[PDB]
Structures are given as structure tokens and as C-alpha cells.
Scaffold this active site. Structure first.
Site, mmCIF file in Angstrom:
data_model
loop_
_atom_site.group_PDB
_atom_site.id
_atom_site.type_symbol
_atom_site.label_atom_id
_atom_site.label_comp_id
_atom_site.label_asym_id
_atom_site.label_seq_id
_atom_site.Cartn_x
_atom_site.Cartn_y
_atom_site.Cartn_z
ATOM 1 C CD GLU A 20 27.852 37.580 -26.487
ATOM 2 O OE1 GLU A 20 27.111 36.861 -27.189
ATOM 3 O OE2 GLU A 20 28.609 38.455 -26.964
ATOM 4 C CB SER A 54 25.782 38.070 -36.653
ATOM 5 O OG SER A 54 26.519 38.924 -35.797
ATOM 6 C CG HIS A 82 -2.088 0.923 1.120
ATOM 7 N ND1 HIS A 82 -1.956 2.276 1.344
ATOM 8 C CD2 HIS A 82 -3.399 0.711 0.852
ATOM 9 C CE1 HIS A 82 -3.137 2.857 1.221
ATOM 10 N NE2 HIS A 82 -4.029 1.929 0.923
ATOM 11 C CE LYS A 128 33.488 41.513 -35.779
ATOM 12 N NZ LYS A 128 32.036 41.685 -36.060
ATOM 13 C CB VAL A 129 36.839 35.517 -31.744
ATOM 14 C CG1 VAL A 129 36.135 34.350 -31.065
ATOM 15 C CG2 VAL A 129 37.807 35.014 -32.810
ATOM 16 C CG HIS A 163 39.070 54.552 -10.494
ATOM 17 N ND1 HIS A 163 38.064 54.929 -9.630
ATOM 18 C CD2 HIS A 163 40.184 54.413 -9.737
ATOM 19 C CE1 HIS A 163 38.550 55.015 -8.404
ATOM 20 N NE2 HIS A 163 39.833 54.706 -8.441
#
Lengths: 457, 458, 457, 458
Positions: free
Chosen positions: B328, B315, B126, B321-322, B185
């Protein structure tokens, strides 16, 4: 008076001990001047740091003997709060707390010069070359704030929470013989004692307080010694080590130089975790506070199983739960403070996180408000909590949760009928069982023992 | 198949092993059915709990040998993931997790009955009388969730973070001789080494991971044995104690019954603090991730002091460029985690009387954070961190313009004869300006200007 | 002096106009006394409410003519800030703001009595029976806070943000002829103009400011008239309507009674939404602030495409972005304030949300800090933003993104070779194209026109 | 099947229509693969966008008739959900959504080529040259996500909340004659009606829903046409304008190109405010939900002024006791939503230069909030709200002890002769005490004491 430097001449109140730099800063930084003056806890801690720094440099041969001794004396005075009125800068200055560091350097320098028989503004004891020797605002501000928060925890938060824990513990022991209705999902469940209920509050505070004390240990790792970017440039190889040692001796806390000085400047993850644990403690206080006002709700349309003391020296059971309201408003403020600190903590860039002042401020605000609220709640409500025996009894005696023993004594059929009658006629199970002749007002008390349900073992 | 509960009979899929209460929950709580099925970590942990419960009840004489052994076998199958498809309920069910507790009881009970040669739905074993003997959903759900979270930390989060710490530690050692410009800074500051910078990332992870492991200890305190409200009513006096003991044996973690059983049901402050520590770790990952993409920015009109592996086209195409895509994904997980923390802590403050009824969502959001961070940290480590390389030329370009390197000249050939070399090798290299002016030779130059001395003054 | 009531005698400073109730409250509520005094904006608004209330009751025949006129005069004085020093209570009092309502009633009552030729403490003008006629703290506090926040938006936040928008718009127009490198994912993308870049900041502020102004409209719905629970018991059927009308006439804002007075007491969802929009505005300010310090990063190891004015009247390009740091620290504080308000907003119970003071306080704090920070950032940084033409040019002229026109003019092969040479020798595409003889320093300028890429249409 | 991109050739399932960049993302971003597949709302909206884009480019002469028509057909099939199983990417990919944009371009291009009798992978209809003509992932992803969120509000959230408002409005009318005790600070206050109380819940929903609809207007401003950074480079001068026009025609919503294209790429403040308004609505639902369970608490030792439908057995059984399970599911969704808001707003503050690269998670957390709230509100409405009934006896029990009902007596028979009736019908009904003392008859009593007059004094 009029102080003169390569930047020009500046007029400073004749009675103030800060210098030209602080005077200019006081006139330029105008954000939140009314409510956001840099916390004095940070100033006092800075005094401790500058005192330890003077001693360390003297011992390491980085400062003249007499000038160092004068600085040590002036610094100690700051620690004792003798110059609190000489720090008028706000929290919203540079993200490195540079203005406050210089404010600390100038005040201590001028006082040191005075002690050495020199008029204020002479710079005999130089704010930067002496008081700020081997240091940067970059490593000293976070060092001062870590010390400030750690001390504030011991000085205000712990005593307040430990006090409430003692109160709840005392109440729990005193009311542990009072059986009452237990509730789950806000619905009638099974019996418990008022002492068990109040004891759970004490337990939550012990658990959350313990976490704060554990996270506190992260604050023992100081940035001191890493100077501008963490390399220690312009500081003696042993400056950081000694300053930490002296801070530890003065506070009684095991302060030390962070294993990694670069990370100690680029982030304050240890402070974020301390604030996070404080937030959890606040959450427990809200849970407890709400339980209190719900249990005291009434006089007749709520629960009303306990009464709270009057707010002003209104009969018992009709008192508005003011202390709960003040406490929970502080709690929601604390959750917001935590949000601010954690958000800021993720925003460091390269060799320096430039959100130091606000991270320190929001954490100290939380500590002080909670300390204030917990102490108030304790003295003005918690200590005066009393059970409403009549209400507690009426709920318990008329509740189906007591029928358990009946089922085994006279069978479920009869027991179910007794309960059905009691609920229908709004009477106690004992009364119903009597009007049915199933059990005498004597036999009932021998079969139905509420405490056996609350303490089954 | 026809299944029944105290409310009546209902129809359930003939090929599924759950019962009536699972079916009702299935139909009555269609909230987040696609993405919020109850975490299997909780289901597996519940299997461990029910196995220990049957073992304890058998040892204490609360269950018959026959049925207990079958339940133990059935429960072990659940732990092994053999019945995962028989748990169709969502996180957004009852706040006590009662429906999932019954889902566990029904599946194990049906499989147990079957193991004993009994038909499904017969309840020979049960769900309530045997599998749930001496238990409540109130104490078992948080027990199962604390175990689930503790195990997930060890199985997924710790290995991932420890792995990244190893990678950064190795990279820091390899680039510890590369002197570069430090930044405060966001402005040019004094020299440091690339190894010290990367090392600071490793340190942040060590510090935050340490706090998570400390908060983890609070999860060792279980609610088991407190039953409905914390009194232990309906449980054998030694039931909770033995179950915690068996769970500790099973997992290798020091599980024990909480000192105060009532607070273990009315709140889950320990879970709130574990999530809080995880949030801090996520914050460190954002700081580190941002440093990484800023250092690799450009590659021509940015900082560009480091380069990273190119794993996809992207894109807009430009030679060299990478886009820092792994950063992200990691930072998007970080902002998700801060939200999870908000959810868990909010729910944690809302307990009422003897029971906090936000258990499922508190456990879910914490597990989601653990799994997403484990996924993203491992991905970031393998697809980016392990491939970080310095851009020596760019690093040197910046360093040569750093005023600190000119300080060794002011006190070597004069402040004017040094500041003049600054108006020459600026408006390229200082080592050249000093040569063209005869003020110093290239041999003596590198003898007076030793950047490493500035990066490592001690 | 010594005031006497059914609760006993109390000593109040002879120069203070508050009564016995406020004196007792001042001595009992001790949470956050230093930094959390009830915002004066709430007090001034309360003065406006009490003034409108006296007028409404007089007109409706609920107050004696002379006593009402004296109250109206005393109330107006509060509005003018003549009695600011007579409100010493903290934010952390009852969740209904009852103490402050009575503080307002007592001060106005005593002043009204004085005007009527009665010594302070006489209660000729009764604090509760007259000044608080037809009102409850339950409906008047939220009414006062909604008015306070709405006015604070117009008085401080809007002027500050609108000012920065004008500044950015002016800079955008002035620098729209300066072509520069555009960046996505932090990587070199395609050309844009400095004016387009700065213009985007102005656009974000316009967009977020517009949302705040839209949410502001929710604050026009006041709880006034619902009294204790929203039924309006003990108030004239037209009291709420008239008070709202008078508040609207005095402020110039379309205030009115909330369609549902019960919800106006049980929750403050309208305030939560206003705070939420302020939070979004703060987020945009952080984005903008960060863009500014990143663009100004340097002098030589960062981006450095723009310069910011010196912090104190350090050459251009070496100035620490202090205004950005102060602004972003305010932003993280604001996100925390929003957390506090939204959290509190979900905690109402039955007929009354008892977190009113803190919800009002955190919203006003956000408004004031943002107003302070935005104005400072504007005057001390934004207005002085200038392009670093040399840096901008060096990046653009040496970047592969300008090769586009070359491919169509001399073919991809030659163009690719020009770019490869320029990058290898760290020279401009023009220089490389010249040393290769593929294009003269004359033909290049005719084929490669950066502006044609930034403004392609 | 072999597919290729500028980086090279890769293998993709022969039965799937995606290409090389989808495959790379599939393999390189194994983050939240089980629960975080990109929302289909975004995929369907992307289908609408690509259809409008092909239509616009064809109208502007940027695409050949043949290929454009095929793309339009293929895109429409995506909008209809015919290709849902060909989108296997997660939310935690590149922050610009480039991978999903290419997933959309590749599927539509392959299906288009096929429609034109061309083989898969042939690129007769090219993913980049045709389907992505004049577009960037930078402007199309946020365009698709704004459309997706706006549509989800209309399709799911509004109908659910409007439905609950209707239910509460009907219940309020039905119980507007039932006088009860109001409560402030949780303490007994002056009388009100059950209708006024329930009506306040309806009002809160009307107020918060109104704010969501106002914030929704910000989503009408699209980034489309700004291409890579906002300049519109590579797009036909009228491309963005026509696409927005076609999307407006398709959806019935007034979509337009944002006034400032740059800010439309660098931030998504409009989405942040929509999420913020949704958070406020969730807060109202928690307040309402809590009122509901507190009013139904007990049923014997709580407040118990209302009863609710019993949909399941529950853990602990007690005759008449019904746990407010629907309230628990709803409030757990509420705390989840507050976390979603935290995530969205945090990400919204993190944009850099010309592009905010947290787009996927901002869109995902907002859609999750919309879907969970729609699910929970509808469930709560159907399984609880519609079944709310008053407990007349309990309501009356409390009211009779309310001091306000005794105020009409103090000025009717004296304060003492009225306060005495309070020491009689307390330490049951006041109407009885006055009778037993002869101070007043039951006929005159109900003439002097009219509770409704207190609940509705105006």
C-alpha cells in the site's frame, strides 16, 4: 457464403475472406466502430508475423510443406495491403486482441485454402491448427504491435521530424547574421541572432528525437514464443527464435525474443517508454510552435520579429498562425495519448496485461498525428519563415541592452543619459547620442557593434 | 546584520550567512514553506558548481588567488552539508532559480570573507563579482539541477531498485521448482512455476531501470557557460568547458557542455525524459506490488498462494491475516510519481523564447520521485519482498484442478476415463480419484502426470 | 460545379453543397483525415445555432424576410442530419474552428439559395453576410460545442449510465439475502451480503453521475453574442440574448448568454469541469469493472463468487470477462481525453482560447465511447450476473470471521480451538465444532447466524 | 516509556504521548519523512471526530461518564493544536490510515488517562476500547479527511481566491475607460478596454470557484458509522448519525452520513471531483497569469501594455525591467496542482472490494493543492495584482495602428482618402496624418474616430 463450425452456421459476405469467428465478433463488438477500427499497421505487422511463423514451423517440421507455402503467400499478400478491407474489428475488443488474431488467422487461412484450390470456408488450411500453429493471441498481438510501432516510427515520424530539423537548420544558418533582442522571463535580456534562436528549436528536436530512437530499441524485444503465459507450451522450442530472426530480416531491425517472455506478456513497459519519449518530443514541438506564433504576433500590437507564409495562395505580418494551432492541438492530444498508455501499462495482472489494443492504438495515433502535423507545419509554415528586419532593428536599436559598449567608451553617466533620452523620446540610442553631441552617427557604429554581444567570443 | 543589494539594505538574522536577495525571497515567496524548501541535493550540487567555477576562473585569470581559494574552501563546506541551515528558500520562487543562486552566492561569499578574516556583510569576497563571476542563474541553476538529479539516481534510486532485483532473483531461484497455476484475464490458465512468476517481476525492474539509466545520459549535457541566454556573454571563453570538466572529475560522471547552449536554457527535455522513464519504473512497481498483494490475498477466502511478514497489529485482528501494508505504501508512492511526471512534462512544454522558467518545480518533482521511490522500494524490499514464502498447500490445491494436468490422462486412459476422473476429484485430488476407480495407481499416476513438464515444456 | 470569388475559381463536386472556402480547406487541412472528422454533434448543433440566428436577425431586422426564412429551413435540414455528408473537414484545423463555421455557412447558404430558386454557388443567400450575420467563428464555435456536449450527455451518456444503475439496483435487491465474505486490503474482513456489494457499485454511479449533471449546468452559459473578442461588435445588442432563448426553446435546456462574454471566448473552464466529472465517472466504472472480474475470477484458482454470462450464445465460471476488458480500455482512453481537455483549457491567450476543436472532440469521444461501453457492459454482462452460491458458502462457512458468536456462546478458548481445527483440516466451523462435540449441527445454526453480522442493526 | 499492542511491547520516547502502533509505523514506514508528515489538517479533524465520537458514545451509553469527559477534553486539546508534535507519522503508511487513527487514539487516550490522574501507558482510558469505540480506521480516516478538506477550502482557498476576484474587479472598474487592442490567435484584433480584459480574469475565477464550491457538497457525505466494510458492525446503531450531527454543529457545515456506507469506504469519488474542480481553477490561474506576464512583457521590446511592482533586484539588471516573478511562482504551483489531480484521480480508480486503500495520498495531494494555491494566489494578489497599472503610451501606440479606427474614416472621407492616411500615419498618429494632409482637422477627427464606440458598441 455460409461457414459451418461446432458453434453453428454463420453468413459471411461472399466477397469477404474472414471467417465465422470474425463475423460473430463484428456483430458483437460495437464500441467505437466509426473511429476506432484496429490500426492497419497492426494488421500489416500481423501479416509479417504469420508469414515468419509459417516459414519457421515449416522449417521445424510443424506444418505440411504445401499448406505452409500457401500460408506464406497469403500472409505476404496481407503485408502488401491486398486484404486491408477484410479486417472490420474495433480496438475495443478483448484486452488480448484475440478477435484480431483470429481475424488475421481466418483471412490468411481462407486465402491459403483458395490458393490450394479450395473454396473459402473449407479450412483446408486451418486458421488455428495451421496459421496459428504454436501461437497464442497473448504473445502474437504484442509481437505484432511492437513491430507495428517500430515500423511506424521509421516510416512516418522520423522522416517528418528529420525534415523539420533540416528546415530549421537551413533557416538558422541563413539568418545567423541578423542580430536581435533576446528574451528571458519574457523580458528584454541581451542580444542574440535570429539564427541562434531558430537553431535552438532544431536542437530540441534533435535531442528529443534521439531519445525516441533510443527507447525504440526496447521494442526489439518480442513476446513471440511464450504462447499463453510465457512458458512456450504448444510451440516448438525454436519457434520464437526463428520467427524473430525472420521478422528482423524482413524489417531490417534487430528484432529478437525478449530475455524474459513472462514479462513480455505481463507488461509492455518498453512501449510505455517509447510513448513517453514521443510525449517529450511533442512538448518540444509545443514550445517551438508557441515561440513561432509569438515571434510572428502582430502586425503591430505584438512582437512581429518574423513573418510566416500566407495560409492560402492578407499581407505579411497579418497571417493567422494556423499551422501552429493545428500542431499544438495535436500536441495536447498526444499528451493525453501518453496518459492512456502509461496508465494502462501499470494495470497488468499476473501473466497477462489486458490493455494491449488501446496501448497500441494510442501510441500509433500519436505517431500518425504528429507525423501529419509536423509535415504540414514544415511545408506550410517553417519553410516560409522570414525575418521582419524593420521590426527586429527597431527593437534592437532602441533597446538599453546595446548601451554596454557605451559605458566603457564614454562612461556610464553619459551612456545612461543617452538611454534615458532614447526611451523618453522613443528614439534609437544612436539618434539620442547624436542629438546630445556625445557621439557622431559615425563613432557610434564603431563602438556599438550588436554582433559582438551576440557572439562575445 | 545589515545586508544590501542593488535595491537597498535589509535586515537578516545575525547568526545566518545569507544576504539581501535571500532575505527578500524569504519574505516575498511564502509558498509551501513547510514542505517545499529547495532540495538540499540542489544546494550541494550548487556547492560543487561554485567550487568548480572558482577553480576555473582562477585558472583562467578571472579571479585573484586569495579570494578564489577562500571561495573554493567555502564551497566545499557547502558540498559537505556544513551550511544546510543557511538555505531557507522554497521551490516556488522565481522560475529561473535566481533567488537560490544568490542564496548560494551570498552564503559562500560571506563564509569566504570570514575565512579571509573579513566581517560578514563586508563582501570582501563579493557574491556577484566573485562567487557568481561569469555566471547567470539561468545557466547555473539547470546545471546544478542536472547534476543533482544524476547524483540522486546513483546514490538512492539505483541501489534500491538493484537491491530489489537481487531479492526477486534469489526468491525466483528458490521457488523455481514450485509448479502453480498461471492466470490470464484473471482466469485459470496453464501451469507455470512460482520462480517464473517472481522472475518476471525482476525482469520488469531490469527493463525499466535500464531505460532510466539510458535517459540519465541526457543529464550529462549541461547549460553551464551559456550565461543569460546561451551566448556566453560575460563568461570567459573557456569557463563553461572547464567547469564541466571539473564537475566530471568531482562526480565520476561524464559531464560536458551541451552542444546547443540555447536549447539548454530554453528547455530541459532531458530531465523530462528521465522523469518519464522513472514513471515507467513506477508503473512496473505497481504491477508487481499488485501481483504480490493479490497472491497473498485471503488468507482463507482469497488467492493466498504466498505469505508475507507481519510487521504490525493492524486495524481488524484475525489469526493469520496480514494486511499487505508495504504494498500500500509503495503503490501510494507510485500514484504520487505519476503526478510528478505530469507536472514535470507539463512544465517542460511551457518554455518561452530563451528561457524555460519552471526550473525549480521540474527539478523538485523529479527529485521527489527519486527519493520517495528509493524510500519505498527499500522498505518494500526489507519489510516484505525478502520474506515472501509460498503456501504450498494452497498452490497445490489449485493446480490439481487445472485442466492441463488432465490432458495427460485423456491420451493415457481415454478421454472419457479421464474426464470422469474430473467429475470425481472435483465435485479432491486427481491422484486419489484415479485410485478409487482403479483406473490407475498412484505410482503410474505421477509417471503420467508431471506438472513440471507443462511449466517447462522446453 | 465551379464557384467564383475574389480569390479565384474553384471546382466543387456537383453533388456537394459546401462552397469554395470549404473546398480549399478540404484540400489544405490533412491532419487526421481518417479518424478525426469534425464530430457531427458539433455540425447538428451548428445547424441549431444558425437556425436560431436567422430567426433572431429576422426579428431584429438584420435579415431580409424571405432569405431568412430560407436559411431557417436549410438550417433545420442540417439539424435533422439531411446534410451530414457535406461536412468533410477534420478537427485539426484553426483553433477557432473557422473552417467548420464557414463550412456550415456555405452549406446552409447554398441550400437556402436553392430553396429561393437559385443555383448552387450564386450566394443569393450569402454565407457570411446572411447566414453568418452578427456572428464570428470565435463565439459561434464554442456555442455550438457547448450545446453539442450538453445534448450528447442527455442523448447518450445519461441513458446508458442510468440503465446500468437500474440493473445493479435490481441485482442488489435480488441478492440482498446472500451473505458472503467482505474484504479489506484484499484480505478477509467481516460478512456482508452480495446485495450490499453490488449496491455499492450502483451508489458510485449515482454519485459520479450526479456530479456530471451538476457540471453540465456550466455549459448553459454560451459565448454567443460576443462576436470576435467579446464586445459584440457587428452584432445587434439583442442578438445573443435571442439566439440563446431560441436554443433553449429547441433543446429544453436553460441556455443563456454567459454573464461574461470575454471569458466565454478566452476559456472553456465549464467544459473542462464537465470532462473532469466524466473522468471521475470513468474511474468508478474501472473500480466496478475490476471488482466484477475479480469476483468472477476462476473457475478454481481465483475468487469466483459470481458468474458472468457467456460472451457468445464454456461453462459458468470459465468465461473470460471480455466486457470488463473493453470497458476498462475505454476508461484509460477517457482519462487521456480528460488530460487533453484540461491541458488545452489552461492554454488560452488574451481574448481567445485557440484549442476549441480538440477540447470539444476529446470530450465528445469520451461521451460516445463511455455510452457505447457502458451499454455493452450492461446488456452483455451486468444483467447476467449471478451468484456462485457454492463458492460463496464454502468461503463463508470455513472462515474465522464467523467465530464471533461462538466466543460469547461457549467461550473464546473453545471457539479458537474450533477455528484452529477447521483451518487445519480445511473444514467448515460447523463441521469442526461437531467433530469436537462442543456444538451439535443444530445448536451451531442457532448461535452462528451470518446475516446478524452483515446486518448487525 | 514502554507501550504495548496485541503484537507486544515497544519503547517510545518518554516525553511523547503516542503508543506502540505509532512507534511501529514510525520505524517501518520511513517514506517521505521530511516532507510528507501527515497533514495536521487531518490530525485536527481527527480530534474533532474523536471528540464527537466520545460525545456520541456517552450519549448512547457506550462509554462511562468519567472516561468520556476526559477523552472529550483531550480531543479538544488536539483540535486546538496543543499536541501537534505527538504525530510523527508519514502519508505513505497503510492505505487505510490505520496507523494515524491509532496515533490519534493513543495520544488522546494517554492524555485522557493523565487528565484522570492515571500514568501514561496505563491505558485507563484505552486507545481501542474507549477512544476508538464503535469505529474502524476504515470509516474514520475518510471521515476525518473529508472534514479536513472541506475546512481547508473555507479557511484558506476561498478567502484567497475571493480576495483576488475583488482585486481584479476593482482594477477592471478603474481601467474600464482605457481602450486598447484586443488580440485573437495572438494577432491584432478589434478594440476592447483594459477593464473588460481584466474583468474576464475575474469572471474565470468566479466560474471556477463556483464549481469548487459545488463539488465541495459531496464532502458533506461521510463514511462514519460504516466501521470495517460498511455494515456498521460493532457500532451503536445511532453512533454514525450522532457523530455527523456533532461534526456539523462543530464546523457549521451540513455533514451527514453517506446514503450508501459501502461506497463511502470503497471509493472517494467526491474527493476526486473536488480535486478536479481545483485543477480547473488552477488552469484559469495559469491563463490569467500568462496574460499578465505577456501584457507586462518587455518593457521595451515586448507588449508592455501594463506594468507591475518590482519586489527584488533580479539576475540581470536593466533600468525599468521587472521580471514577473510572482507569475512564475503561481504557474509553477499550477503545474504542481495538475500533477496532484492526476495522483488523486488515479488513486480513486484503484479501490478494491470494500475498501479503497489509497486514502492518505488522495487526501494529502488534495490538501497540498489547496495550501499551495492559497499561498500563491494570496502572494500573487498582494505582490503583483494589486499593483497592476496601465502603460497608457504603449496602449495608445498600438490602438492608433488598429485598422478598426480607420473604418470610421473610409465612410467619412472616402476609402482611398482613408487608406492613404494609413500609408502616412504608419510607414505616427492617424490624428496627425489627417491634419498634415488637410483631409480633416483634429477637432473633427476625434468626432469621427471614437475608439470607445468600438470597444462598447452596445
Amino acid at each position: 457464403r455460409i461457414e459451418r463450425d461446432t458453434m453453428g452456421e454463420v453468413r459471411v459476405p461472399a466477397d469477404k475472406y474472414w471467417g465465422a469467428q470474425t463475423q460473430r465478433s463484428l456483430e458483437n463488438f460495437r464500441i467505437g466502430t466509426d473511429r476506432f477500427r484496429m490500426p492497419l499497421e497492426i494488421i500489416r505487422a500481423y501479416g509479417m508475423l504469420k508469414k515468419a511463423a509459417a516459414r519457421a514451423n515449416l522449417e521445424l517440421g510443424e506444418l505440411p510443406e504445401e499448406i505452409a507455402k500457401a500460408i506464406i503467400q497469403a500472409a505476404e499478400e496481407v503485408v502488401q495491403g491486398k486484404w486491408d478491407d477484410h479486417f472490420p474489428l474495433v480496438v475495443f475488443q478483448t484486452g488480448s486482441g484475440t478477435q484480431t488474431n483470429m481475424n488475421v488467422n481466418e483471412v490468411i487461412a481462407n486465402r491459403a485454402s483458395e490458393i490450394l484450390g479450395k473454396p473459402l470456408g473449407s479450412k483446408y488450411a486451418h486458421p488455428n491448427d495451421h496459421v496459428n500453429r504454436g501461437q497464442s493471441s497473448n504473445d502474437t498481438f504484442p509481437t505484432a504491435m511492437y513491430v507495428a510501432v517500430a515500423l511506424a516510427l521509421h516510416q512516418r515520424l522520423y522522416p517528418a521530424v528529420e525534415g523539420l530539423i533540416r528546415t530549421f537548420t537551413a533557416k538558422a544558418q541563413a539568418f545567423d547574421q541578423i542580430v536581435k533582442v533576446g528574451r528571458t522571463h519574457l523580458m528584454d535580456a541581451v542580444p542574440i541572432t535570429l539564427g541562434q534562436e531558430i537553431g535552438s528549436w532544431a536542437a530540441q528536436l534533435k535531442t528529443t528525437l534521439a531519445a525516441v530512437k533510443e527507447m525504440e530499441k526496447g521494442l526489439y524485444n518480442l513476446a513471440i514464443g511464450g504462447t499463453a503465459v510465457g512458458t512456450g507450451l504448444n510451440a516448438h522450442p525454436r519457434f520464437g527464435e526463428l520467427v524473430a530472426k525472420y521478422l528482423a530480416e524482413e524489417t531490417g531491425l534487430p528484432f529478437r525474443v525478449a530475455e524474459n517472455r513472462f514479462a513480455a506478456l505481463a507488461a509492455h513497459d518498453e512501449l510505455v517508454n517509447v510513448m513517453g519519449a514521443i510525449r517529450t518530443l511533442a512538448g518540444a514541438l509545443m514550445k517551438i510552435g508557441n515561440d513561432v506564433r509569438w515571434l510572428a504576433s502582430g502586425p503591430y500590437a505584438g512582437i512581429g520579429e518574423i513573418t510566416i507564409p500566407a495560409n492560402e495562395p492578407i499581407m505579411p505580418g497579418k497571417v493567422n498562425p494556423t499551422q501552429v494551432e493545428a500542431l499544438t492541438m495535436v500536441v495536447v492530444r498526444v499528451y493525453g495519448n501518453d496518459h492512456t498508455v502509461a496508465f494502462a501499462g501499470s494495470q497488468g495482472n499476473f501473466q497477462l496485461n489486458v490493455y494491449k489494443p488501446v496501448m497500441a492504438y494510442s501510441t500509433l495515433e500519436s505517431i500518425n498525428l504528429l507525423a501529419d502535423a509536423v509535415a504540414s507545419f514544415d511545408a506550410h509554415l517553417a519553410q516560409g519563415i522570414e525575418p521582419n528586419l524593420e521590426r527586429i532593428e527597431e527593437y534592437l536599436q532602441k533597446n538599453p541592452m546595446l548601451a554596454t559598449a557605451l559605458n566603457k567608451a564614454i562612461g556610464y553617466d553619459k551612456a545612461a543619459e543617452i538611454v534615458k533620452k532614447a526611451l523618453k523620446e522613443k528614439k534609437t540610442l544612436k539618434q539620442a547620442a547624436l542629438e546630445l553631441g556625445y557621439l557622431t552617427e559615425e563613432e557610434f557604429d564603431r563602438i556599438v557593434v550588436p554582433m559582438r554581444l551576440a557572439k562575445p567570443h
